[PDB]
């Protein structure tokens, strides 16, 4: 069973927070992966992008740790990327799955031209950066697919993006920086102010304010 | 260096004749056989790594 250790975890467990988007609305940190299991656990799929052996030089030989990169996400507009370093590979993979779940961000999807049906591509050109690696996502027409390298393609397919153009600069052989730059670009989709988002923000009650009585009485 | 050993390993390996086996299908039939193997009936799929030429 799951016993929460935070106010957000308790509110989610008690069926008081309706969706993950109510947590995203208030930019609240998610510190328990069981919340993500509660909301998207029936559709989350994780892929191990890389196992990377890192070494620390010691007095007697080389200490070796394993760094697992795990991309998670339902194919319907949520994606996360987690990196975990551990003594053993299996522990690294488990921890990286947990960290990917904890880092899951909402993905905004738009239209390239005319707006028939559901959104298929990125709402506009976005760019993510990580250590000299620059990843640019460009809206693509319907049926284009993802014109990208395999790692950004995995991340973008896991984010529910159907059509995309990709441009990469830097040392994309650094799979970690490539993955983090793609994740950053995908994250910037909902932080980009477009004219359809100009309407004045109407504030609603926070989860920590709406269900204060439940937290106190518990 | 010396050129004396030229067909050393190729000449010194025991000559083993190719076994007689029935011809493989070609064209659309070979692709049909491949499709059946990969996609139609697959039992050992239980979350483990299996290769088409696994010797273990």
């Amino acid at each position: 069973e799951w016993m929460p250790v935070t106010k957000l975890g308790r509110l989610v467990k008690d069926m008081k927070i309706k969706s993950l988007e109510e947590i995203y609305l208030f930019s609240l940190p998610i510190k328990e992966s069981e919340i993500i299991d509660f909301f998207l656990g029936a559709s989350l799929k994780d892929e191990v992008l890389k196992i990377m052996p890192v070494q620390k030089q010691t007095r007697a030989g080389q200490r070796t740790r394993f760094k697992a990169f795990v991309a998670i996400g339902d194919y319907n507009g949520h994606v996360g990327l987690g990196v975990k370093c551990s003594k053993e590979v299996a522990t690294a993979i488990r921890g990286a799955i947990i960290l990917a779940k904890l880092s899951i961000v909402p993905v905004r999807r738009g239209y390239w031209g005319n707006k028939i049906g559901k959104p298929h591509t990125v709402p506009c050109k976005v760019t993510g950066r990580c250590g000299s690696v620059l990843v640019r996502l460009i809206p693509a027409p319907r049926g284009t697919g993802i014109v990208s390298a395999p790692v950004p393609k995995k991340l973008l397919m896991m984010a529910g993006i159907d059509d995309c153009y990709t441009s990469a600069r830097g040392c994309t052989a650094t799979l970690g920086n490539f993955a983090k730059a793609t994740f950053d670009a995908i994250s910037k989709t909902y932080s980009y102010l477009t004219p359809d988002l100009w309407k004045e923000t109407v504030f609603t009650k926070s989860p920590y304010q709406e269900f204060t009585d439940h937290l106190v009485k518990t | 260096g010396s050129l004396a050993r030229a067909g050393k390993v190729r000449g010194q390996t025991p000559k083993v004749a190719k076994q007689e086996k029935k011809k493989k299908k070609t064209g659309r039939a070979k692709r049909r056989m491949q499709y059946n193997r990969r996609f139609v009936n697959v039992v050992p799929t239980f979350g483990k790594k299996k290769g088409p030429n696994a010797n273990s």
Binding site: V48, I51, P53, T64, F66, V89, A90 | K49
Partner: peptide, 27 residues
């Protein structure tokens, strides 16, 4: 979990078969 490939990797992180095991674990 393919504990075989992971354990063979921990046997030799930089071994002759290290790239094959690393590729096997990826996916």
């Amino acid at each position: 979990f393919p504990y075989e490939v992971s354990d063979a990797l921990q046997d030799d992180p930089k071994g002759k078969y290290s790239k094959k095991l690393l590729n096997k674990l990826v996916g």
